[PDB]
Amino acid sequence: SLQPPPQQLIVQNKTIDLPAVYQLNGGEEANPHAVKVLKELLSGKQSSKKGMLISIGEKGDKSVRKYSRQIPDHKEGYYLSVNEKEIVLAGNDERGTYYALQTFAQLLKDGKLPEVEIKDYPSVRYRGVVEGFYGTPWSHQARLSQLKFYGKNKMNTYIYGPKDDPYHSAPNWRLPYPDKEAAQLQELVAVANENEVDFVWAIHPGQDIKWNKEDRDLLLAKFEKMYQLGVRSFAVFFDDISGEGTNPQKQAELLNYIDEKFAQVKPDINQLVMCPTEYNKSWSNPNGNYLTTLGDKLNPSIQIMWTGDRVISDITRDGISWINERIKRPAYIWWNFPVSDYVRDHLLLGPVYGNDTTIAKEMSGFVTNPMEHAESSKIAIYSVASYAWNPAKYDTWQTWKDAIRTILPSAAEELECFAMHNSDLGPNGHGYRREESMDIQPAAERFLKAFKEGKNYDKADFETLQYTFERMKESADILLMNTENKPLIVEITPWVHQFKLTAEMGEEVLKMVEGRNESYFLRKYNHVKALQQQMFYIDQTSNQNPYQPGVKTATRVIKPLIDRTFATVVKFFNQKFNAHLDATTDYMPHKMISIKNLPLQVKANRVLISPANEVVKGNSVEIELDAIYPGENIQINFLEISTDGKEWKTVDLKSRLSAGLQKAPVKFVRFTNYLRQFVLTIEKK
Numbered sequence: 019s020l021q022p023p024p025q026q027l028i029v030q031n032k033t034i035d036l037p038a039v040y041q042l043n044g045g046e047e048a049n050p051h052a053v054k055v056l057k058e059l060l061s062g063k064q065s066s067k068k069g070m071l072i073s074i075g076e077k078g079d080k081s082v083r084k085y086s087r088q089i090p091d092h093k094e095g096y097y098l099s100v101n102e103k104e105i106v107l108a109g110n111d112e113r114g115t116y117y118a119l120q121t122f123a124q125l126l127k128d129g130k131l132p133e134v135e136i137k138d139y140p141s142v143r144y145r146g147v148v149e150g151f152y153g154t155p156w157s158h159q160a161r162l163s164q165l166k167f168y169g170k171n172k173m174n175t176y177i178y179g180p181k182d183d184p185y186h187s188a189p190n191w192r193l194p195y196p197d198k199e200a201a202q203l204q205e206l207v208a209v210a211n212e213n214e215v216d217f218v219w220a221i222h223p224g225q226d227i228k229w230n231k232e233d234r235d236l237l238l239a240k241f242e243k244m245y246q247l248g249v250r251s252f253a254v255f256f257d258d259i260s261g262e263g264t265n266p267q268k269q270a271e272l273l274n275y276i277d278e279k280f281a282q283v284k285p286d287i288n289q290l291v292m293c294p295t296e297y298n299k300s301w302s303n304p305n306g307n308y309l310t311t312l313g314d315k316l317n318p319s320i321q322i323m324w325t326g327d328r329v330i331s332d333i334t335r336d337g338i339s340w341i342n343e344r345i346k347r348p349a350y351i352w353w354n355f356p357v358s359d360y361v362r363d364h365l366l367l368g369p370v371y372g373n374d375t376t377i378a379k380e381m382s383g384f385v386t387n388p389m390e391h392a393e394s395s396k397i398a399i400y401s402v403a404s405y406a407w408n409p410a411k412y413d414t415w416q417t418w419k420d421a422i423r424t425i426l427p428s429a430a431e432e433l434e435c436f437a438m439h440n441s442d443l444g445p446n447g448h449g450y451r452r453e454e455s456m457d458i459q460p461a462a463e464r465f466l467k468a469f470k471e472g473k474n475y476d477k478a479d480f481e482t483l484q485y486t487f488e489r490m491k492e493s494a495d496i497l498l499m500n501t502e503n504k505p506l507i508v509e510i511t512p513w514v515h516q517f518k519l520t521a522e523m524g525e526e527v528l529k530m531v532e533g534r535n536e537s538y539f540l541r542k543y544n545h546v547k548a549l550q551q552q553m554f555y556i557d558q559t560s561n562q563n564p565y566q567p568g569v570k571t572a573t574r575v576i577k578p579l580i581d582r583t584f585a586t587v588v589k590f591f592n593q594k595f596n597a598h599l600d601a602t603t604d605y606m607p608h609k610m611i612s613i614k615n616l617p618l619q620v621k622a623n624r625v626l627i628s629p630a631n632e633v634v635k636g637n638s639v640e641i642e643l644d645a646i647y648p649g650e651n652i653q654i655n656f657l658e659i660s661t662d663g664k665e666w667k668t669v670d671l672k673s674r675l676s677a678g679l680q681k682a683p684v685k686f687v688r689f690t691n692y693l694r695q696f697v698l699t700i701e702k703k
């Protein structure tokens with residue numbers, strides 16, 4: 019499946035062998051990056067003046083003079099033709115010729131080419147990725163891999179702006195990169211240029227910027243530095259800041275200054291972009307006028323970025339019309355998917371969808387903000403490259419499958435199985451969700467109520483769950499050992515481990531459903547409990563970031579199914595045999611008695627009670643740790659401690675209820691007379 023799909027495609031059914039003897043026409047006047055690709059394809063084939071002609075070049079070249087009228091008159095457009103007599107690879111520009119070769123390479127199968135006529139061009143002018151997330155910035159090697167991936171999928175934009183790069187954001191955005199980083203950035207630009215990608219260096223100065231000559235000059239001096247490293251596209255982000263830096267009049271004036279004294283002075287600067295402080299409709303203030311000030315004052319050639327109606331949002335026709343009228347220009351979309359820096363315990367490997375497919379002319383650009391997991395993000399990036407190039411023929415699921423099969427041919431279905439059940443973000447402050455496990459959801463749904471009630475589940479639904487769990491284990495084990503894309507595996511490995519544990523736990527619970535004899539049920543029960551403890555261990559030792567630590571997987575349909583199925587069968591067992599087995603579904607080494615049902619959670623060196631959305635009102639709550647730990651503090655948000663529970667030692671409190679424990683021994687905590695937060699922090703391992 020050609021990705022992206024071309025605008026115009028006519029496929030006659032006839033296969034042409036890749037010629038052993040060929041005459042190369044226009045190879046010395048054509049895009050070097052395109053010809054190099056063409057010669058890579060033809061290695062063991064000799065070139066002489068006798069043989070099948072291959073015409074490569076840009077419009078205006080003598081080599082493709084014949085086909086100048088068949089070439090699309092769009093930027094980055096190209097004409098491709100294959101018949102039994104000659105091969106034509108003609109771009110409207112150099113980037114167009116390169117893109118003709120990327121399509122040409124996909125057509126090559128079994129050293130055989132189909133006879134085909136293609137006229138192709140992008141519906142959107144700028145298409146690519148913005149590395150603009152919070153978290154560990156992409157490694158150098160990952161970024162090199164990304165740029166080669168962009169070239170293949172006809173993405174012409176890479177905007178560098180990792181939030182946690184100290185030379186991108188505050189305060190060291192004033193300082194030039196050290197020699198080591200600078201050498202690396204210089205390499206990224208060279209590689210980006212070979213792949214026809216515009217490397218856009220973004221700066222994020224707004225937080226501590228002052229509107230004067232001094233900071234103006236340092237910003238321009240920093241841009242001059244990047245320019246010496248090869249950078250020819252630049253951006254200025256004013257997102258996520260407070261203070262004077264939020265001034266629209268001043269931002270416009272700054273960008274116009276950059277535009278007029280730098281971008282227009284240099285002979286070869288391409289893109290100039292800015293991210294406004296108000297980058298979505300929901301956080302746009304209607305009382306004052308920020309967006310219309312930018313629209314009127316900012317030079318038209320300058321791009322303005324937009325994430326949609328909300329921070330995380332799908333782009334609609336009415337939504338983009340809303341912003342465009344205010345900024346007086348077509349918006350440059352910053353789409354915050356599959357970025358997961360606010361749900362860092364989830365991987366987002368599902369399909370790209372929700373964005374309107376008819377609004378191509380209403381947007382100046384479209385870039386995707388990704389996960390800090392570079393390889394894992396290629397699934398979305400592949401799909402965005404497809405949506406961006408030809409939104410009209412954009413096929414959500416098909417492109418998702420093609421992405422997976424492109425990224426990991428040796429284990430496509432295993433990676434498909436894994437990503438099928440790792441797409442939803444789970445609950446979050448943005449309220450942004452994605453479908454997950456839709457294949458098996460109807461069967462999982464029906465099974466649960468049937469089980470919960472006296473009714474009888476359909477056998478088919480039961481076997482569907484068995485197959486799913488069995489297939490998940492296969493996928494997990496095969497992915498772990500896969501050597502085709504080692505960096506990909508390193509990224510997802512913790513989730514793969516948790517994935518397999520989920521599958522195993524599910525298998526054991528299904529065996530508890532049948533039940534048969536009593537001894538067998540207990541064996542499965544003890545096994546499930548041990549599996550809960552293993553999932554707990556991974557959740558506490560893998561991916562321990564400061565925000566959403568741990569590893570969650572299959573959260574939308576599967577984990578609730580297994581948990582609810584487990585809690586119900588244990589309930590029936592306690593009823594039948596008059597037992598008192600624990601129906602808890604998440605392991606918790608500590609205890610909390612008394613806010614009665616609220617489960618405890620461990621996050622790093624914190625032991626906390628799961629908050630609620632209700633209104634709470636000489637009662638007391640007690641938390642018992644599994645051992646004695648040195649206490650740091652106790653942050654309650656709307657007190658007494660002991661090491662044995664006999665001798666209690668009162669602690670004084672202070673919006674936020676602070677209480678230093680001063681490394682005192684802690685095991686029991688109590689609070690005698692709404693709950694936003696109830697955290698005990700203890701000393702770390």
Ligand SMILES: CC(=O)N[C@H]1/C(=N/OC(=O)Nc2ccccc2)O[C@H](CO)[C@@H](O)[C@@H]1O
Binds near residue numbers: 152258358
């Ligand atoms: C324009 C934009 O998307 N900014 C950040 C963005 N976050 O917007 C915020 O919610 N930032 C914020 C909100 C309130 C207080 C402080 C920062 O969306 C992405 C995923 O969350 C981040 O990667 C971006 O860096």
Ligand SMILES: CCOc1ncnc2ccccc12
Binds near residue numbers: 152258359565
């Ligand atoms: C001023 C810092 O904010 C942040 N810090 C860390 N992670 C984040 C993830 C999404 C949005 C914001 C974030």
